[PDB]
Design a protein around this ligand. Structure first.
Ligand SMILES: NC(=O)c1ccc[n+]([C@@H]2O[C@H](COP(=O)([O-])OP(=O)(O)OC[C@H]3O[C@@H](n4cnc5c(N)ncnc54)[C@H](O)[C@@H]3O)[C@@H](O)[C@H]2O)c1
Lengths: 21, 338
């Protein structure tokens, strides 16, 4: 919830990166 | 005169792209005049020069100061601002941004470069929502020069789409399933660690790691007749580069392995020259580093059952081959710039 917020705010962060291979 | 290019995100794709441009610089309509990245110029110069996969860049001197990186005495201005709205695109007269951060793949995200002054954006990834998607060799000629934001799709879709087109035209694809056996990429953690996707959290060099992929569905964007007819998955494995697509299709016109191979060989020599390479050699992933094709068909692996179920296998260098396509798409846009 604070984690989902952190990935919205920081989508390049290590915890967040989703690359479409 | 030249189309003025800035790279946003100087990562594996951003630096592979840059290296592709430096090799083809003499015949190009693009001039790379700016880079934005989280990192500073000296770090970027160092990583551009020293690459664990591409080796040391020998073609020309690479150097840096506080403001610029210099590649063969071509000066590239550097800036470091995570918010594309703040970037000096008007001031630098930027025509085209290469969006390679992996973060600004929605129209609204990418449009931040336009409002900062660039005229167009080419996203080095699938777009989210209504963004025109191109694969060179498949539908790049449908590009409309009025478009301000485009996508060059994924490495995998670049590998699969040209094979699918050739197979569709010869045999008629009714349905098809894909698995890419893919090198690990920078979205995976090095050791088990916190991640939004519980698979991407796991140690990349120690595991086979499944992920969902949009790559097969995305072929339906670039070959609209096949929309909703393709799906697949990805399996990441402990190699750092070079990947392979495994495609099993149900086709209308009955065939055999020899004929499937022949038809892809014929396309590789004509309509798909430079995009698909046809190989009968017994090679392995390492041998395909630095290959310029989007797809290298591994002819010996082709097989067919009951006339209608066709399997083909195609290699691709996911960093370099894809970066060559990004460059091709940009050159194309520059040749068609109103
Ligand atoms: N095989 C491949 O690597 C491959 C193939 C096709 C497409 N792609 C896509 O290209 C994109 C980048 O992949 P990569 O492997 O180059 O990743 P990478 O993580 O090596 O490169 C990303 C770069 O962008 C930078 N960055 C991140 N956020 C930024 C911001 N807000 N502003 C400025 N710089 C920022 C990072 O610091 C890094 O230098 C992803 O969308 C990926 O899906 C990758």
């Amino acid at each position: 919830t604070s984690f989902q917020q952190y990935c919205d705010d920081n989508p390049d962060a290590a915890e967040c990166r989703i690359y479409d291979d | 005169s030249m189309v003025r290019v800035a790279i946003n995100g100087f990562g594996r794709i951003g630096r592979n792209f840059m290296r592709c441009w430096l090799q083809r610089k003499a015949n190009s309509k693009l001039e790379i005049v700016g880079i934005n990245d989280t990192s500073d110029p000296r770090t970027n110069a160092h990583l551009l020069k020293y690459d664990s996969m591409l080796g040391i860049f020998q073609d020309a001197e690479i150097t840096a100061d506080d403001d610029c990186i210099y590649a063969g005495g071509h000066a590239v201005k550097c800036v470091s601002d995570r918010n594309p709205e703040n970037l000096p695109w008007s001031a630098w007269g930027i025509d085209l941004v290469i969006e390679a951060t992996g973060v600004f793949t929605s129209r609204e995200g990418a449009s931040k470069h336009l409002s900062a002054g660039a005229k167009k954006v080419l996203i080095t990834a699938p777009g989210k929502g209504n963004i025109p998607t191109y694969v060179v060799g498949v539908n790049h000629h449908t590009y409309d020069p009025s478009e301000d934001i485009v996508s060059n799709a994924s490495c995998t879709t670049n590998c699969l789409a040209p094979i699918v087109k050739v197979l569709h035209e010869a045999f008629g694809i009714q349905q098809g399933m894909m698995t890419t056996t893919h090198s690990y990429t920078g979205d995976q953690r090095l050791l088990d660690a916190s991640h939004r996707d519980l698979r991407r959290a796991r140690a990349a060099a120690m595991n086979i790691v499944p992920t969902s992929t949009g790559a097969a569905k995305a072929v339906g964007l670039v070959i609209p007749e096949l929309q909703g007819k393709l799906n697949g998955i990805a399996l990441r494995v402990p190699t750092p580069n070079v990947s392979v697509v495994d495609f099993v299709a149900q086709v209308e016109k009955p065939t055999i392995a020899e004929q499937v191979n022949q038809v892809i060989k014929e396309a590789s020599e004509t309509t798909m020259k430079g995009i698909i390479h046809y190989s009968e050699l017994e090679l392995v992933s390492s041998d395909y580093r630095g290959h310029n094709a989007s797809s290298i068909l591994d002819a010996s692996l082709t097989m067919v059952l009951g006339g209608n179920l066709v399997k083909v296998v195609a290699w691709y260098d996911n960093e370099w081959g894809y970066s060559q396509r990004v460059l091709d798409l940009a050159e194309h846009m520059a040749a068609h710039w109103a």
